[PDB]
CSV table of C-alpha atoms and ligand atoms in Angstrom, one decimal:
chain,number,residue,atom,x,y,z
A,10,UNK,CA,0.0,0.0,0.0
A,11,UNK,CA,2.0,2.9,-1.4
A,12,UNK,CA,0.3,6.3,-1.0
A,13,UNK,CA,1.6,9.0,-3.5
A,14,UNK,CA,1.6,12.7,-2.6
A,15,UNK,CA,2.6,15.8,-4.5
A,16,UNK,CA,5.1,18.2,-2.8
A,17,UNK,CA,4.0,21.8,-2.4
A,18,UNK,CA,5.0,23.6,-5.6
A,19,UNK,CA,7.7,25.7,-3.8
A,20,UNK,CA,9.4,22.5,-2.5
A,21,UNK,CA,9.2,20.9,-6.0
A,22,UNK,CA,10.9,24.2,-7.2
A,23,UNK,CA,13.5,24.0,-4.6
A,24,UNK,CA,14.2,20.4,-5.5
A,25,UNK,CA,14.5,21.2,-9.3
A,26,UNK,CA,16.8,24.1,-8.4
A,27,UNK,CA,19.1,21.8,-6.4
A,28,UNK,CA,19.1,19.2,-9.2
A,29,UNK,CA,19.5,21.6,-12.2
A,30,UNK,CA,21.8,24.3,-10.8
A,31,UNK,CA,25.6,23.9,-11.7
A,32,UNK,CA,27.2,23.7,-8.2
A,33,UNK,CA,30.3,21.7,-7.6
A,34,UNK,CA,30.7,21.9,-3.8
A,35,UNK,CA,28.3,19.0,-3.4
A,36,UNK,CA,29.9,17.5,-0.3
A,37,UNK,CA,27.8,19.7,2.1
A,38,UNK,CA,25.0,17.1,1.7
A,39,UNK,CA,26.8,15.1,4.3
A,40,UNK,CA,27.2,17.9,6.9
A,41,UNK,CA,23.4,18.7,6.6
A,42,UNK,CA,22.2,15.1,7.0
A,43,UNK,CA,24.5,14.5,10.0
A,44,UNK,CA,23.2,17.7,11.6
A,45,UNK,CA,19.6,16.6,11.1
A,46,UNK,CA,20.7,13.3,12.8
A,47,UNK,CA,22.4,15.2,15.7
A,48,UNK,CA,19.3,17.4,16.2
A,49,UNK,CA,17.1,14.2,16.4
A,50,UNK,CA,19.5,12.7,18.9
A,51,UNK,CA,19.5,15.9,21.0
A,52,UNK,CA,15.7,15.7,21.0
A,53,UNK,CA,15.3,12.1,22.3
A,54,UNK,CA,18.1,12.7,24.8
A,55,UNK,CA,16.3,15.8,26.2
A,56,UNK,CA,12.9,14.1,26.3
A,57,UNK,CA,14.2,11.1,28.3
A,58,UNK,CA,15.3,13.1,31.3
A,59,UNK,CA,11.6,13.5,32.2
A,60,UNK,CA,10.5,10.3,30.6
A,61,UNK,CA,13.2,7.6,30.7
A,62,UNK,CA,10.8,5.1,29.1
A,63,UNK,CA,11.5,6.9,25.8
A,64,UNK,CA,14.7,4.9,25.5
A,65,UNK,CA,13.0,1.5,25.9
A,66,UNK,CA,13.2,1.3,22.1
A,67,UNK,CA,17.0,1.7,22.3
A,68,UNK,CA,19.6,3.2,24.7
A,69,UNK,CA,22.5,3.8,22.3
A,70,UNK,CA,22.5,7.4,20.9
A,71,UNK,CA,24.6,7.1,17.7
A,72,UNK,CA,25.1,7.8,14.0
A,73,UNK,CA,26.4,5.2,11.4
A,74,UNK,CA,27.6,6.1,7.9
A,75,UNK,CA,27.5,3.0,5.6
A,76,UNK,CA,28.8,3.0,2.0
A,77,UNK,CA,27.9,0.2,-0.4
A,78,UNK,CA,29.6,0.5,-3.8
A,79,UNK,CA,27.6,-2.4,-5.5
A,80,UNK,CA,24.1,-1.2,-4.3
A,81,UNK,CA,25.4,2.3,-5.0
A,82,UNK,CA,24.1,3.6,-1.7
A,83,UNK,CA,25.2,5.8,1.2
A,84,UNK,CA,23.2,5.2,4.4
A,85,UNK,CA,23.1,7.5,7.4
A,86,UNK,CA,21.5,5.7,10.3
A,87,UNK,CA,20.7,7.6,13.6
A,88,UNK,CA,18.9,6.4,16.8
A,89,UNK,CA,17.3,9.8,17.4
A,90,UNK,CA,13.6,10.7,17.9
A,91,UNK,CA,12.6,9.6,14.5
A,92,UNK,CA,9.6,10.8,12.5
A,93,UNK,CA,5.8,10.1,12.5
A,94,UNK,CA,3.5,9.5,9.5
A,95,UNK,CA,2.2,13.1,10.1
A,96,UNK,CA,5.8,14.6,9.8
A,97,UNK,CA,6.4,12.8,6.5
A,98,UNK,CA,3.1,13.9,4.9
A,99,UNK,CA,2.1,17.2,6.5
A,100,UNK,CA,4.1,18.7,9.4
A,101,UNK,CA,7.6,18.8,7.9
A,102,UNK,CA,6.5,20.3,4.6
A,103,UNK,CA,4.5,23.0,6.5
A,104,UNK,CA,7.6,24.2,8.4
A,105,UNK,CA,9.7,23.8,5.2
A,106,UNK,CA,7.5,26.2,3.2
A,107,UNK,CA,8.8,29.5,4.8
A,108,UNK,CA,12.3,28.1,4.9
A,109,UNK,CA,12.2,27.4,1.2
A,110,UNK,CA,11.0,30.9,0.4
A,111,UNK,CA,13.6,32.8,2.4
A,112,UNK,CA,16.3,30.5,0.9
A,113,UNK,CA,15.2,31.1,-2.7
A,114,UNK,CA,15.1,34.9,-2.0
A,115,UNK,CA,18.7,34.5,-0.6
A,116,UNK,CA,20.0,32.6,-3.6
A,117,UNK,CA,18.6,35.4,-5.8
A,118,UNK,CA,20.6,38.2,-4.2
A,119,UNK,CA,23.7,36.0,-4.2
A,120,UNK,CA,23.8,33.5,-1.3
A,121,UNK,CA,25.0,30.1,-2.3
A,122,UNK,CA,23.7,26.5,-1.9
A,123,UNK,CA,26.1,25.7,1.0
A,124,UNK,CA,24.0,28.1,3.1
A,125,UNK,CA,20.9,25.8,2.6
A,126,UNK,CA,20.9,24.7,6.3
A,127,UNK,CA,20.2,28.1,7.8
A,128,UNK,CA,16.7,27.9,6.3
A,129,UNK,CA,15.8,24.5,7.7
A,130,UNK,CA,15.7,22.8,4.2
A,131,UNK,CA,19.2,21.1,4.5
A,132,UNK,CA,17.6,17.6,4.0
A,133,UNK,CA,17.0,18.5,0.3
A,134,UNK,CA,20.8,18.9,-0.2
A,135,UNK,CA,20.7,15.1,-0.5
A,136,UNK,CA,19.5,15.7,-4.1
A,137,UNK,CA,22.9,17.3,-4.8
A,138,UNK,CA,24.3,13.7,-5.0
A,139,UNK,CA,21.2,11.3,-4.8
A,140,UNK,CA,18.9,10.4,-7.7
A,141,UNK,CA,16.5,8.7,-5.2
A,142,UNK,CA,16.3,9.1,-1.5
A,143,UNK,CA,14.6,6.5,0.8
A,144,UNK,CA,13.9,7.3,4.4
A,145,UNK,CA,13.2,4.6,6.9
A,146,UNK,CA,12.0,6.0,10.2
A,147,UNK,CA,10.4,5.1,13.6
A,148,UNK,CA,9.0,7.3,16.3
A,149,UNK,CA,7.9,6.0,19.7
A,150,UNK,CA,4.3,7.0,19.2
A,151,UNK,CA,4.0,5.5,15.6
A,152,UNK,CA,4.7,2.6,13.2
A,153,UNK,CA,7.8,2.3,11.1
A,154,UNK,CA,7.5,4.1,7.8
A,155,UNK,CA,9.3,4.3,4.4
A,156,UNK,CA,9.4,7.7,2.8
A,157,UNK,CA,10.7,7.8,-0.8
A,158,UNK,CA,11.2,10.4,-3.5
A,159,UNK,CA,13.2,10.6,-6.8
A,160,UNK,CA,11.9,14.2,-7.1
A,161,UNK,CA,9.8,14.9,-10.2
A,162,UNK,CA,7.2,16.5,-7.9
A,163,UNK,CA,6.2,13.6,-5.8
A,164,UNK,CA,6.9,11.4,-2.8
A,165,UNK,CA,5.4,8.2,-1.4
A,166,UNK,CA,4.7,7.0,2.2
A,167,UNK,CA,4.0,3.4,3.2
A,168,UNK,CA,4.0,1.2,6.3
A,169,UNK,CA,7.4,-0.5,6.3
A,170,UNK,CA,7.4,-4.1,7.4
A,171,UNK,CA,11.1,-4.7,6.8
A,172,UNK,CA,13.6,-5.1,9.6
A,173,UNK,CA,12.7,-2.9,12.6
A,174,UNK,CA,15.1,-0.1,13.4
A,175,UNK,CA,13.8,0.2,16.9
A,176,UNK,CA,13.7,4.0,17.0
A,177,UNK,CA,15.3,6.5,14.7
A,178,UNK,CA,16.0,7.2,11.1
A,179,UNK,CA,17.7,5.6,8.1
A,180,UNK,CA,18.5,7.9,5.2
A,181,UNK,CA,19.4,5.9,2.1
A,182,UNK,CA,21.0,8.0,-0.6
A,183,UNK,CA,20.9,6.3,-4.0
A,184,UNK,CA,23.8,8.2,-5.6
A,185,UNK,CA,24.1,9.6,-9.1
A,186,UNK,CA,26.4,7.9,-11.5
A,187,UNK,CA,28.9,10.8,-11.2
A,188,UNK,CA,28.8,10.9,-7.4
A,189,UNK,CA,30.4,7.6,-6.5
A,190,UNK,CA,33.4,9.2,-4.7
A,191,UNK,CA,31.0,9.2,-1.7
A,192,UNK,CA,30.8,5.4,-1.7
A,193,UNK,CA,34.4,5.4,-0.4
A,194,UNK,CA,35.1,5.7,3.3
A,195,UNK,CA,38.4,7.5,2.7
A,196,UNK,CA,36.4,10.2,1.0
A,197,UNK,CA,33.5,10.2,3.5
A,198,UNK,CA,36.1,10.4,6.4
A,199,UNK,CA,37.7,13.5,4.7
A,200,UNK,CA,34.2,15.2,4.5
A,201,UNK,CA,33.3,14.4,8.1
A,202,UNK,CA,36.6,15.9,9.3
A,203,UNK,CA,36.2,19.2,7.5
A,204,UNK,CA,32.6,19.8,8.6
A,205,UNK,CA,31.3,17.4,11.3
A,206,UNK,CA,34.3,16.7,13.6
A,207,UNK,CA,32.6,18.0,16.7
A,208,UNK,CA,29.3,16.2,16.6
A,209,UNK,CA,28.5,15.1,20.2
A,210,UNK,CA,27.5,11.6,19.2
A,211,UNK,CA,29.8,8.7,18.0
A,212,UNK,CA,29.9,8.6,14.2
A,213,UNK,CA,31.1,5.3,12.9
A,214,UNK,CA,32.2,5.3,9.3
A,215,UNK,CA,31.8,1.8,7.9
A,216,UNK,CA,34.2,0.4,5.4
A,217,UNK,CA,33.4,-1.0,2.0
A,218,UNK,CA,33.9,-4.7,1.7
A,219,UNK,CA,34.8,-4.0,-2.0
B,301,PU3,C1,13.7,19.7,9.5
B,301,PU3,C2,13.1,18.9,10.7
B,301,PU3,C3,13.8,17.6,10.9
B,301,PU3,C4,13.2,16.4,10.1
B,301,PU3,N1,14.2,15.4,10.0
B,301,PU3,C5,15.1,15.3,9.0
B,301,PU3,C6,15.1,16.2,7.8
B,301,PU3,C7,13.9,16.1,6.9
B,301,PU3,C8,13.4,17.3,6.5
B,301,PU3,C9,12.1,17.4,5.8
B,301,PU3,O1,11.5,18.6,5.2
B,301,PU3,C10,12.1,19.8,5.5
B,301,PU3,C11,11.6,16.1,5.3
B,301,PU3,O2,10.4,15.9,4.6
B,301,PU3,C12,10.6,15.7,3.2
B,301,PU3,C13,12.2,14.9,6.0
B,301,PU3,O3,11.6,13.6,5.6
B,301,PU3,C14,12.3,12.5,5.1
B,301,PU3,C15,13.3,15.0,6.6
B,301,PU3,N2,16.0,14.3,9.2
B,301,PU3,C16,15.7,13.8,10.4
B,301,PU3,C17,16.2,12.7,11.3
B,301,PU3,N3,17.3,11.9,10.9
B,301,PU3,N4,15.6,12.4,12.4
B,301,PU3,C18,14.5,13.1,12.9
B,301,PU3,N5,14.0,14.2,12.1
B,301,PU3,C19,14.6,14.5,10.9
């Protein structure tokens, strides 16, 4: 049971801009996604000081970065707060609306794409490198879900009955033909060092078996 939804026009326009614009400093996708993960981890950590049962779905607070050259994927797995069905379909796009507008206005007027994160739309920097993005997520108050979009103006949301993640978020970046450098841990390690060296959660960089 796949449900298909249209993005708001502005977010479809943001996505096209990110896909079509000539912009070589693509590696900032990684910083933004790790930051979203850190935020999510901050959130479940904070909530659990007043409700320690919020960790019954997992005590470890961590981020894993897993390259896979033959699937052509880069996965970022966190054990943060995760996302509900409502976030995926309605809530997150509602917040993103204003962020997308301010950002667009800032690009016009000569800000650049690396500044995307200051407007709360950093997630979409994934499309700098990924042809398709799949998000597996699990919040304590909800079922596990699979969110998916290859842009083109749509996303899908379905109940995911694959392996439980317990709590948190799996971002699977299906990378573009020309973006395979990010399937290498030596390249990923370099990008983590320049941008994300002080994240206050253990970031394990997996190694290709390849
Ligand atoms: C921007 C608010 C944060 C939403 N979010 C994000 C970024 C995000 C941002 C979204 O729109 C701005 C979005 O809807 C398309 C989304 O869904 C897949 C994700 N990553 C995480 C994460 N790893 N864990 C918990 N929440 C997250």
